[PDB]
Each structure stands twice: as structure tokens, then as C-alpha cells.
């Protein structure tokens, strides 16, 4: 009857349903990208494979793609159980970064406390860096900051305050640690001019059209501007691939709005966000930009460090188990790893952790207070909008083991996800980048239907609402004699405005 | 947001649309048993006509019930504009009356020795000698015991008991014909079903009337009685069990599910139990109804001064409005419409108030309390029913139209009490009649015979009722309507269309 | 735990509190002027006598507000008991009226559907009325009518429609009666220019500053400077007159906030009201502005025709008891008797029927959700305001027997009665204007202290806040070991902002 | 209106006012037992010191003691800045531990024979066989049991029973000196109070610990053993729950009324139950305690990488936030402040998100559900102290000043959680500091003699409160604040009045 009474009432005694409707983004690198690793990723509950372009060359991720690829239609042979498999983008953007330590002995220079760092610009240390010269790769830098201004390295841990200026910086180490190769470089509260899309990006990101990838992670998006030349980069051909802007700086918070209206879905990149805006809080705009997403409709993703120690340990912290219990109770629709699945020692224990976690909390939702929240907040005019609230409420209603969609761009399955249903949402599609893109958002199973289009549109129907009934049951989403809500189109669909309330055969 | 906020905002400026979705109950009696006049209040507004069977011969009513069908039919020739009207059996049940006067009244003051005797000599009764019909009233009330006379307007108190009543009148007044008697706080050993109950009841049998109200009704036990009394030949008639006396409210629970509807019947409630709680009564019966999709009718006494006045008091206004508002299916008018010198103007002022209070529901609040109470259930036709209200608010819709034979699918959106009306197509005469007991539901009957091809006959009723939802503008030609059928020849499909 | 539930949980078996919160006004007359029936009309529940001056002379009043005040003050002689009773002047202002009927025989002419009637404005028909001439007082009403305007007659029941007009009305008789003498008449959609304060209410309204009466019900309120030209004539030494602005035409209602804000207090006069605007929309009138009232903190008066047939009837129909339930519910601070005790058969009975209904109604408040929707709709700075809610919230915390409340002006009573406790305010006041002008809002049982003040500030509170104690107690509403809350001021009161709980002695 | 509109307006560039309420529990060790750190640690935000007794002797933890309480009276020259810090005791329990490895540590991989005997003889540890200190381990688990060692990373499952348990390695890993053991889905006969827990339960009577965290409760009983070990010399020192088992959680609602207050340590919890359900427990824990007015911790890994690391990770953030968020009134600090490099930063990261996660409450909606569900009570005590919130969001006050002896008014204050900071000034030197274990509550002692004159020394201390207030940047003169007072030497009596 009110949230502190529902959340007394939580019993981790009770078990959750079979599916996990969260999105489950895993960031492949050289402790995932077998083909052999891969498949068990997939197994153990991989959605999307992320690759970041602020490493690597073409023809390595070119590899990685296609063992994903690889290992994804080794599950084909069954479209029951084939279970679709997204790949993103993720774009270098803007990005500051230290040089290579030199190599001579052992890496890890150690940075100490008061102790004097010069910071260059000249390339002929752009592989020699140390604790005495350090080399980053922003040629204006000593253009945007100033004496007293605080220079942080290696995710924040190394802060750095300049004393003296030149067209060279001479800095004091604040917080000491040890200095590895290539670091990523923030400068919060500084005006950084580098471009939105640089040389490299328009590269990568037409690499991307050319690989047909279904989305596109564009970091460091600012205003609304940076995400349209995105969008003329991929231009057509690209047409059809979604862009979420990663929001990691203080003037996409600012402006998040603008940049939610031109993008497809949203990012909370905490890791750059957490430095360039402080710590304390990140919480603040994590659960503002899934709220607003969640009102508008569109995915919004939860990144950067939500399971950190598991890159060396088998087990989770406490604080990593909350963190992802806390997102999806937030509302995020997919949840991502970055270090832990590329780098680490324990990828698939963390895309299992994640499993376990979010189907726990997806249990935990108050689900009628949020759907009532969510509809007070949107009387619009679409059939297959009220179609789709009239489907998730009739699935409360009967207890639906499922809601079965029927949808070649996904549009109508979108729309059940935003409602939050608790039954999974089947999405039947014949268009496999439909399938695909489809994991952006919670609740929805994408099933790809190999069948050849039926003679009659009704028995096509059928058939394509048949599979989605054993796909449901093979799974054990349910079983004969329960029911399910079927959304199919009008006639030979256009507006989704046909809902059934059908027993499983 | 709040409902403090949502009363603030009510503007009296603003005109109702949506056609009025509460029906209108009639008593029939001389000031309208005219063919003529009865035209007249179809079209004031009239859907359900109720035949008091506490007076009159099965001869009279039969031959109202005649006029009524004939007034009714004369509007068959359109099935685009005919409106159904049912017919409702309400039953004498436990009444104690009193005799006649030696037709003339006779005049008791405080004070006065009114004596009661069960001596059928005294029938043809005085300000000294008081005969009643119940001959064991003795020793079912006992000392001071307040027995009262006359809708509640005479009262009197006990002295000495009997075999007879030695009575000391508490509130005086006059006449003293055939009026009825009612003892509050006694056990009236009266049985629910008499011989004349058991012999109306049968009459509406082969009347085919479409419902009954059982008067008295005390018990679950009461309701049963009724129903196999109807019998097999019976089965479909509604059984409305109207709650009138203590024991009906204390046990309404065991009541309402034996029943098909209840009927506030507050003009002897309103004397068997305090009238300073009637209302408590009223909008309990009605929540609960409400709660179990199960028609209400708030009755008596609603328009009363307009039996020998034009324009309704500002109390009675007030009554009809609160009605609708507390939820009630049916608002019912008796001697207004039965012996009153403007029973048109009744049933007219009536359908305007119910159309300004629907107008001021918050629609919205309403649904959701209806929708968090909803058990959970596996009927596909609840869960279509329940996705087919929530559709028809977030779309607009012009209307609801389910195809239904039996009328349960049609009742089971107006149990979640969308906006939009429910426009009910059925080929069962019954039904369409049946459908006026629940808020919402406007019958249109289909005569067209059935096609062979069953998707060709769901067409053919679905065309029907958008034609009758644009001749009653309802909607028109591109508004968003709800459409609810079946597909195996269960209600569970839903298709939101535009109106063709 | 929502309004339908609380509404399936009333028992007409639970016994309501003691305490009767609503005002009840009783309209005097010659039915309940004598000194003797006046003594039983206040020990039946009446709170404010109100003097009709659409009727009557000064003589006449004066001798009333007399014997009004005899009764009152022969309960004097218990100040425990004593129940101060406030005295209303109801304007007449401006009034439309027919003539004396032709005395010729008997009374009430018969008027007949499609018989024509014609009005005169020629005072020598003036007390010659009759079914074929018809003389009114409004001089002016041959420019405001045109042809095929309707006019009313006696309370709406009679209707006409001028068929000819001149500088006379030839009109045919749409809705017939019978006619009887000086009978109000209603223009309803035509502009009638009659003043809002005549002449004769410029005397009246003196008359009251004479007689010390302690509220106006301004008749036929429009506007703002309509109740202006009211606080002008009242000016100084009316100063303290509460103005309580009736509503009862079309744009009294559609310019009720100027009205409200202007107004003491509001008074729905659905006699009127129900004549100038369709019958079938007074309800939404009546409930938009007692909730308009509500928010507002303004003593809100629902009146007119509550127990109509008690005029005739010792009990009514079932229509009129939840007419004065309903009212209430809607939260109406007083409710009105208007004929049913200044003329009729039965005025005690029907001053007790309001009283029984009335207390019906309280029991039935959801009052959590009266008093959230309430805080809601108003964060100020007033220290009494804050004390104020923090005493009813306490109330209902420890379920209190009242909430004894010290003001000489009443604001801090007033502002508890705002927020709707359950508990009775029993407002202890040295000031008998104000314990008799404290009827006008729901739930304050005032009583006047006539105890010499004490020396000590401190020996002087307690000593009011004994009289409290022993009030209760003896009239039911609590007993030794309840507990209760007190509101005093803060030192020798000023911000009524020192709350107490205390057990009762 | 909706939470959803809630957070979609949360704004970061808003900076929080109103000073953190969330009380900051800090484990002291090596790393912070100087009076220097502690010192800059008190500066920093420290409200509670915590001694682990899992680990330590008497005389080094007298020591830190010593020191703990030399810092925080380093500060108390000055009254109005003086901030009272809270000494903790945690108990080790029925803690099962292993075996000195023959310091260093071994590596045990997946499929190995690991071998666990009782025998002590092999307590000073090989890659063959381990060594554990509860000798009825045997017996109490069975085929396959899934043993865990070192805080959950190692796991085994069994082989062979016996009187000595033979094991395959699940997963492996390196050490294993004195290093943990759980036994999920078992019942462990050890007892919750050992004789190392009788006699450093004692020992934190005799060093004036304000408060014991009694690690593995199972049920009410264990509670009640603490209590009465405790004895009627520690009859004040309050006694907080430790859940950390599945027993603890399924017997919650017994431990909880029988215990001052709840920690949720979920360092063990998250290895006794599935660590993605240790969330589920939290919150359920968290919002019974809110619910009762009973302290509650959230404690265990909250910035865990800020041992090694002068930054947290984005999940720990979270972690903290949301634990304010839940409705914990304390947050706590391990190893973190105990053994880590960065102590200073750990408490001062605490202090900056819980008052960033205060200011994002929806605090009016949190205050009406703890009215809404605040049962109906006659004393009052309550009945002042809702009344006093309810005011202070009204007036937005600049705080609630509360005279208290016992602390008990204040506590009931903070139960229903107002924005406005709650003053609680008492001479009870005692009652200052366990007031840190309740959100809101900011202790102030009294060291000024009681005037003769009750008035007199009530208007002492509200004026001693004022200073504080003014002081700390609370409130300014003008602003309008609420004090709680009694009139009879019940904390009974409210006035709203403006800040001299
Ligand atoms: O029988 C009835 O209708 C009644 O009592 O009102
Ligand atoms: O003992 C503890 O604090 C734990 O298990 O987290
Ligand atoms: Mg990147
Ligand atoms: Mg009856
Ligand atoms: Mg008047
Ligand atoms: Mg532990």
C-alpha cells in the first residue's frame, strides 16, 4: 500500500520468475573474444558485445565481430533457443590520454606526493614517459588551463595541480600512485576543444557501418550537435543504427534534454562522469537520466564498474552487488561490465553475477505503482499505444506468462517495454537487426522467426504466435494451460491494435 | 490530483458530453400506464420499468406490462434508435398493513389509547381500534417497543401485551387506510417468499419479465427462495434483492453474492434503521457492489416532491447527483413516476442530473481504485475487459462495443467503469433489456440473421453498432473506438479501430 | 487505503463521537420566535439564529433578536454548559417580488398552462394581483426582457413567457399553479440592474450594526465591489461584522474567487442558485465552492431546502437526509434551516435531524486523507500555522478528546478548524463575539471565560485551560486519564505556538 | 508528486544544505589508533568508533580506546563545537577460523584433495590438509556442502564424512592463515555468546562502551543471552543485532524486538545467503527498522576499494548513497578505516555522499508514510513528537531542539524522520553519544550547573541549543525553529519560536 510497507515486505526467500529482463552489456577484449569463451558469455546471459575504439585497430576488432558473430549462430539450428546477439560500438570521442613509460627495467613509474611532474607536449617523449616528463596526446591543453587548475590520470586516481604554464606544464603530484602506459587524462572544469567527431571517429564509426553493427556508443556527447554529426557521419546505410549518447561531463548532464530528444538511448558513463563532476554525485544523475528515459520511452544503459573487483576475484563486493541491484530497481533497461568481461580473470562469473542480480531485483519492483507513475506521466492518440497499456495491464490482471509481439521494426514491443510489464515480451520478428537491437530494452525476448512468410496473412500469424508458444515453453517462461497476451497487427501490420488473451496450447 | 483539487475545478459552464450512462428505473402506475405517455418517457429517458406488486391485480400489470412492450416496439422499426426497455417484477415480501377506515382518515394525537387487535372484525377502524394483517405481532416486540405507522410518520409506543396491543401514540398525524407498519429493532418471524410472493414470482415467469426485485430480503437464505421459486423456466431472470431492514445490511455480504443486483430500498430502510444512518448504508451497499461488478440501484424518495410539483427541491438535486457519484448503476423513481401529476419531467430531470454527475467523476481515480482491487483471475474476458478500460483512457475512446450473447462480457467492462459508453450488440432479446441494470452499457438488438461465415457475422454486429454509435452521436467517422470479440465462436480479443 | 475501501468499510453499527462539528443555522420565524421554543431550539443543536429581512420591520426584529438572546442567556449561570449562540442578518438585496393577491374570497389565484397573464409594473394593482394581472417591484423589468424570455415565479415553480412587451408584459403560462402573494421572482440569463445594496439594505445593515449582530449573509453577491459596498455601509463599529457572501446567480459563481477573496465567508444559496442556473448543475456549484472554502480556510454555509418537507412532515424523505449528509461530507462548516424552523410544523424536529445527520457525516470523513489533501494545498512561516497542523496531526496520533485551543480572536481555533481534527477545538475565549462568531467554523465548540483575569500569566492560562477540562468532561467529549491538546501563546499570547499533550485531570 | 518526477528533477549542480544527518561508524586498527588521525578523523565526520574483537587483545584495544577518547576531548574546550564520538564493541561470535599456514600463504586450484582435520596438530597448514578451530564441524554438513574460506572466495565441497572431512576444491585461490569460514545452509551448534564474548563483554562494561555489536544473532534468545552477560551495570549500553546469517533474516522481526538496533552486515550475510539476494535483505531490514524507530547500519565493503585507492569506485558510491537512500541511519567504515591507506578519505567520501543522498529524499513523502503507518498511541511523548515534525515541514524550520535526559524524546523525533536537524541537548554524557545511532540526532552536552529554578535551566540549555545552532551554521537569528521541553520535571510541550 506504500513503498516502505512493499519494501518491508521483501523475502529473499521467494524466488523470481525465469526471465531476466534486464540487458546484460559485456565489453569483449582478450579475455573474452574466443570463440569458445564467447559462446559460454552468450550462455551465461551476454545480450550485447561492446567494443570500445579508444583501443585497437580496425583489423583486430574485425576479428572479434566475426568470432561473435561466430559463436552466436552456433545456437542457430535452433531458433527456439537461438538467442539473438547485438554488437555496439563504442567510439574513442574526444579523449585525453598520457604516452607509453619507457620501457627500460619495469613499467609503473610511481608518482609521489609533492613531488614535481613536468607535463610535455613534444612527441619525442611520447614514448618515454616517466616520473619526470609525462606525454599526453591534447595538443591545445596548455590552452585550457591555468596555474592552480588540477589534472587527474588513470581514472582519477592520480591528481595533478599545475604550477607553472608554457606552450609545457610544470605540475605538482597532489595524489600519488603508480603511472602506467597511455591513461586516460581528465580536466574537469576546463573548456577541452577537441572535436565532438574527430578523424578517427568519422573512421571508426564508417568502419561500423561497414561491419553492420546495430549501435553506436558515442562518447563525451555534449549538446545536441554533437549527436547529429553522428548521425550525417552513418548518414544513410546508417540510417537504421541507434546512437546512445554516453553522458560522462558536466554539460551533458547540463543539456541531457537536447541530447535525449536526438538520441536513440542514453548512457550513464560513470567512469568519466565521476571525475569530470564529483563523486558524490554521480547517484544524482544516474537515477535523473534513467528517470527521464524511462518517462520518454527511450534505453538508458548503467556502465563503468558495477562488478570492478571481479576483474581479479571470483566474487563480487557488497557495494558491486547493490550497485546492480540498485540500477535496475532504478529502472535502467541494460546494465554493462567493461573491465570485467575484456580484461579480467573472471568474465563469465560476472555476466552470471549480473544475471543472478538483476533477475532478483526485477523481482523486487513494486511493478503497479511504477506502471501507475508511468502512465500518469504519458492520453495520447495511437492505437498501438493504448493497445500496448491495455496489453501490460491485462497481463497483471491474468498473471501472463508472457506477452507475445508481433513486429518487424519493434516499435510495438518498445512500446510494451516502457509500460514495464512483468511477464517477458516475446518479440517475434522476421528482421534480424530488429532482433538485435531489441535487447536496448527491458523485458523484450527477441525470437527471430526463419520460417518463410506464409500464403495466408492469418495462418502466417498463427504461426509466427505459434513459435513465439514454444519458444515460451522450451524456455520456461510457461506451460500449457497458462496464459499469454498476443499483440498482432490489424490487417495485412501497420498500427499493433489486435490484443488476445489466449491459453497456451 | 487530489480530490479536494478535482472538486475545486467542477465548472457548472461546462456541458456534458457523453451521453448519460446511468439508468433510469420507472414505476409504473395510473399517471403512466398510458401507451401514449409511456412513449414519452422512453424517450425522456426511461430503460427499466418497475411494477410494484404491493397493490394492484395480476390483470392491471399484465396490461401495463402489455402497453409497455407496446410502446417500446413502436420504436422497433429504426434497431439504429430503438432502446430496450426491460420490465422488473418488485414483490409485496413481508409487509405489514393496516385497515381500512370505517376510505376517509381518522385523526390520533399524543397521547391518545390506540389499541391493535388481530380480530378481523375491526378490518373495515378507528382512533380507538387499530386492526393490522400480521396476527402474531404480539410477543415479537414487547414494552415501549416504538412501532410506527404510515411511512414511519406516525409512531407509537406499547403499553400492555397480549394473544392484542394496548399502544400509547407518540407522534399523532392522520388517515389510517391500508398504510403500512414497520417494528425497528424486532424479528418480524414473516417469511420472506409468501403466497403472494410465490404467485407474483411465478406471474413474471410467464410475463417474461427480465428481473425481480425480492422486497425484505433479511438473508442469503431469502435469495435462494426467490431463485428456485423462478425455477428452470426462471433461470435468467435477475434477482435483485432489495435491502431494507437491519439484518439485510448486517448480513449484505451473504446477500450480494447469492443476488444479481441489490436495491437500496431507503424509504422503509430509512425507518427500520435510524435515517441519520441511511446514507452510511447507501454508499457501503454501493462501494461493495461497486467492488463486486455487481449492479446497484439507489430508489425512494429521490425526486418525491415532484409528484405534485414541475421542479425538483434543492435536496432532491442533491440526492440523484450524490447517487450517481457514490456509484449506483440504476437511480430509480417510484410515486413520481407511478401516481404523480409530472412523472415526464421526473424521468427528464433525472437524466439531466446523471448526465451533469458522470461528468464530474474523476474517471480516471475511479478506474485505478477498481483496477488495484481487481482479483486476479485467469478469465481471458477479465483480462480483456480490464485492457479494454485502461485502452479506451489512454486512446479517448468514443466507445467500447462488445459483441456478447449472454451480456457477461459487456458487464464485466462496466464493472471497471470506463468513460467511454458500451455499446452491447446481441441478438438476445433479454440481454439488450438485461444490459440497463449496469452503468454503461447502452443494447442495441440485432435482428439480421446470422451469416455463415462467423467473421463475416462479427462484421455484420460491429457495423451495426458503429452505425449506432454515429446515429446517436456517440462518435463519428474517424474516432477511435474499441472493439471486443471473440475469434473461437470467451470475449479476448481486443482491436483498436477507427470508426468507419 | 483508497476511497472505495474506506467508503465498503461504513457500519451503521459503529457509534459516532459525541461531538457534533457542523454549524447548524436555524432561520427564526414566527414558528420558533417565542422566548420558550428558543430555549429548545438551542438545547436541540441550534448555533447561529439568522433574521430573513426580505420579510418584515425592525420592530419585529428587534423584539426576535431579544428574545433570541433571552433564551440564550438563561443557560448563563453554567459557563460549562453555557452554549454561545451568534445572531445573522440575511439582506434582502436585490429582490424581485410580486404583489398582495386579490383579497377577495380566498388566497391563491389558479394559473393554467397557455392562459395569458399579463405584468404591470401600475402600483395600483399592486395589492390586486390576480390570474389576469400581475404586478412586480422590479420598475426596470420592461428592458431587460424581450420577447420569448422566461420568467419565474415562486421558487421556479411557475414560469412564464412574454409573448408582448411595452412599457407593460403580456405573457402566457408555460409551467401553471397556484399563485400566491408577494412571491420571488427570477429573470434568470437577463441582466437585471438593481443595486446591489438598496436603500432599505443600507437600513438593515445599519439596523445590524445597532443590534450588534455578529454576521451578514449578503444576499445575490456578483462581484467584489458588491461586497465592498456591504463592508462600506458596515464601515467602522461594523468593522468585526463577518461578511459571509451568498451565492445564488450565474456570475456570483463565475466570479466566486474575487468574491471568496473579498468575503468572510460564503454562503451556496441553492434557492436562488437553483433557479438562475439549471437545477441539474447546483451540486457541482455547491461542491466546488465548499472545496474552493476548504483550501481556502473560509467558512463555506450550504443552505436552502436541506429538510424541506419538515415544514410539513416530523420526519423527512430520504432525499433531505442525505442532502445534509452529503453536505457535510463535502465539508461544508454550517448547514442551513430556512422554513423548516421559521415557519413550519415541526422546527425542533428538524434542528435535531440535522444535528443526528450531521454527526453521521463526521464519523464518516476519511479525515487522513481530508488532512493530506489539505497540507498538501497549502510551506508558510507562520508559527501559528505550523503549531496549528502540529496539533492535528498530534490529535489524531493520540486519538485526543479535544484540541483546547486559548484565542480572543479566534484566528489560532480557526486555523486548527482549517486542517478538519476529529477531535472537538474547544476554544476558550473572554471575548463573546468571538465565541459566538466561532459557529461559523466546523468543529470549535466555543466557550466564554467569565472569570476575572488572574495576576499571574501563568496562574491565568492554566485557569482557562481548566475551564477547557471541566467543559469536556462535562459534555462528554472527554474523561480523566484521555489526553488532550492544548494551544496557548507564547509569553503575556501573540503566535499561538506553544502545544502541549496532557492527560486530563 | 510520483517518485519518477522525483528523480527526473534531481539536479547535481544544487548544492546540499542542511549538514549530514546519517551517522558515520568508523572500525578503528592500526592505520587510525593515533590520537593524530583520530583527531583529524573526528574533523573529518567520525560519530561512532568501532572495535572489531574478532582480532586484538584487551590492552591494545584499551589503548585505542584511550586514544579515541583522548581526540574527542581534545574538542571539548569549546561546548558549542565540541562533537561527542561513541566507543563501539563488536564481538567475534561463532566464528570458524583456520590454521597458521607453515605467514605466507599456499595455492589450492580447482579439482585438489583438500583435507580438513581437527586435530591441532596441524594448526601451525598445507595444500593437503586444513586445519579448523570448530571441532564439531563434522556432522553438521554432508555430502557436497560447499564449504567457503577467506571472506567467500575459496570454495570446496565435501567428499568423505567422518568423526575429518575430505574435500574437492571448487574455487581456488592463494593464502590461508587464520582466514574464515562459512557454512551456508547449516546450523552451526556454536553458540552465539562464547566465553571470548562473555569476557569482552564484560571487558566493555569496564571500559563505558556505549553500545555492543553482537555479530551472528540468530533469534531473540541470543539477544536476550547479550542483555543479561551485560548485567545490570550495563543495563544502558545499547545492544545492535548483527544479521549476517539466513536464520538472522528468516527470525528478523524477533531479533528486532528484542534488540536496541540492526546492523546489516552483509560482509557474511552475502556468503550464509546468495550475495544477489543480500540487497533484498537490506532493504527489508532497513525499512522494518524505520518502521519500528529502531537504529539500523549499513556496513561491510561500502568503499572497499578505498583501502588501496584514494577514490571510490562508482559502485561504491552508489553503494552508500542508496544505503542512505534505503533509510539507514548509520554508514559504516571496516577495513577501510581500520587497515587501509586512506582513511581520512574514506570518512570524508561518506560524510560527502550521505548528505548528497539526504538532500535527494523526498522527505515530506518519507515523513507521511511513517505518519500514515505510525501506530495509535497514548503517549505523549509521540503524540509531541509527530506533532513536531509535521511543524517543522510546515514552518521549514531550522531545526528541533529537544531537551533529553535518557534521549528517548529525541529518538522519537528522528522516528519519523524531519528534514530539519534534530539539537538534542541532555548532560548525559552517555545519552550524547549513542544519540549518533539515530539519523538526525546532533548531541550536544550540557556541562552548566542545574539552575535551581526548572525554568530557568530548561531556558539555559535552549539558549545553549541556540548557540550550538548558530554556531554550526544550522540556523541564524530570525530563522524559526521548534523546541521540545517538558513542563513538569514527558517531553510534552512544543513552541515554534524564532531564533534569538
Ligand atoms: O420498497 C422500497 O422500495 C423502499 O422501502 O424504499
Ligand atoms: O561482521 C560483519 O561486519 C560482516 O559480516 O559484514
Ligand atoms: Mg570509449
Ligand atoms: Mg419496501
Ligand atoms: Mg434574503
Ligand atoms: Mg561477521
Same mark, same amino acid.
Given at each position: 500500500d506504500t513503498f516502505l510497507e512493499h519494501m518491508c515486505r521483501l523475502d529473499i526467500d521467494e524466488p523470481p520468475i525465469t526471465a531476466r529482463n534486464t540487458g546484460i552489456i559485456c565489453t569483449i577484449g582478450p579475455a573474452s573474444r574466443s570463440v569458445e569463451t564467447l559462446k559460454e558469455m552468450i550462455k551465461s546471459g551476454m545480450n550485447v558485445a561492446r567494443l570500445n575504439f579508444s583501443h585497437g585497430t580496425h583489423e583486430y576488432h574485425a576479428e572479434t565481430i566475426k568470432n561473435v558473430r561466430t559463436a552466436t549462430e552456433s545456437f542457430a539450428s535452433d531458433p527456439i533457443l537461438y538467442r539473438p546477439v547485438a554488437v555496439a560500438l563504442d567510439t574513442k570521442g574526444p579523449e585525453i590520454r598520457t604516452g607509453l613509460i619507457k620501457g627500460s627495467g619495469t613499467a609503473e613509474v610511481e608518482l609521489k606526493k609533492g613531488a614535481t611532474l613536468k607535463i610535455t607536449l613534444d612527441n619525442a617523449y611520447m614514448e618515454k614517459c616517466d616520473e619526470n616528463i609525462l606525454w599526453l596526446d591534447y595538443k591545445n591543453i596548455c590552452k585550457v588551463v591555468e596555474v592552480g587548475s588540477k589534472i587527474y590520470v588513470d581514472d582519477g586516481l592520480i591528481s595533478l595541480q599545475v604550477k607553472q604554464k608554457g606552450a609545457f606544464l610544470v605540475t605538482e603530484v597532489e595524489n600519488g600512485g603508480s603511472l602506467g602506459s597511455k591513461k586516460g587524462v581528465n580536466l574537469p572544469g576546463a573548456a577541452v576543444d577537441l572535436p565532438a567527431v574527430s578523424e578517427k571517429d568519422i573512421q571508426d564509426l564508417k568502419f561500423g557501418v561497414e561491419q553492420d553493427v546495430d549501435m553506436v556508443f558515442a562518447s563525451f556527447i555534449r549538446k545536441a550537435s554533437d549527436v547529429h554529426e553522428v548521425r550525417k557521419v552513418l548518414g544513410e546505410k546508417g540510417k537504421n543504427i541507434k546512437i546512445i549518447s554516453k553522458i560522462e561531463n558536466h554539460e551533458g548532464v547540463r543539456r541531457f534534454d537536447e541530447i535525449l530528444e536526438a538520441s536513440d538511448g542514453i548512457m550513464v558513463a560513470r567512469g568519466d562522469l565521476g571525475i569530470e563532476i564529483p563523486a558524490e554525485k554521480?547517484?544524482?544523475?544516474?537515477?535523473?537520466?534513467?528517470?527521464? +528515459?524511462?518517462?520518454?520511452?527511450?534505453?538508458?544503459? +548503467?556502465?563503468?564498474?558495477?562488478? =570492478?573487483?571481479?576483474?581479479?576475484?571470483?566474487?563480487?563486493?557488497?557495494? =558491486?552487488?547493490?550497485?546492480?541491484?540498485?540500477?535496475?530497481? $532504478?529502472? &535502467? $533497461?541494460?546494465?554493462?561490465?567493461?573491465? =570485467?568481461? &575484456?580484461?579480467? $580473470?573472471?568474465?563469465? =562469473?560476472?555476466?552470471?553475477?549480473?544475471?543472478?542480480? &538483476?533477475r532478483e531485483a526485477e523481482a523486487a519492483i513494486y511493478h503497479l505503482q511504477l506502471f501507475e507513475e508511468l502512465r500518469r506521466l504519458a492520453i495520447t492518440s495511437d492505437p498501438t499505444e493504448a493497445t500496448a497499456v491495455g496489453a501490460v495491464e491485462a497481463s497483471f490482471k491474468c498473471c501472463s506468462g508472457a506477452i507475445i509481439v508481433l513486429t518487424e521494426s519493434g516499435r510495438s514491443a518498445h512500446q510494451v517495454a516502457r509500460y514495464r510489464p512483468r511477464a517477458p515480451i516475446i518479440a517475434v520478428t522476421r528482421n534480424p537487426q530488429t532482433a538485435r537491437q531489441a535487447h536496448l530494452y527491458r523485458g523484450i525476448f527477441p525470437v527471430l522467426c526463419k520460417d518463410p512468410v506464409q500464403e495466408a496473412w492469418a495462418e502466417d500469424v498463427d504461426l509466427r504466435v505459434n513459435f513465439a508458444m514454444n519458444v515460451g515453453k522450451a524456455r520456461g517462461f510457461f506451460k500449457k494451460g497458462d496464459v499469454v497476451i498476443v499483440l498482432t497487427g490489424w490487417r495485412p501490420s501497420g498500427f499493433t491494435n489486435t490484443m488476445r488473451v489466449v491459453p497456451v496450447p
Open positions: 554521480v547517484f544524482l544523475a544516474q537515477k535523473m537520466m534513467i528517470g527521464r +528515459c524511462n518517462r520518454a520511452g527511450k534505453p538508458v544503459i +548503467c556502465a563503468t564498474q558495477m562488478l =570492478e573487483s571481479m576483474i581479479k576475484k571470483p566474487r563480487p563486493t557488497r557495494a =558491486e552487488g547493490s550497485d546492480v541491484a540498485n540500477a535496475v530497481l $532504478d529502472g &535502467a $533497461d541494460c546494465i554493462m561490465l567493461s573491465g =570485467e568481461t &575484456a580484461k579480467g $580473470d573472471y568474465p563469465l =562469473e560476472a555476466v552470471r553475477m549480473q544475471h543472478l542480480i &538483476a
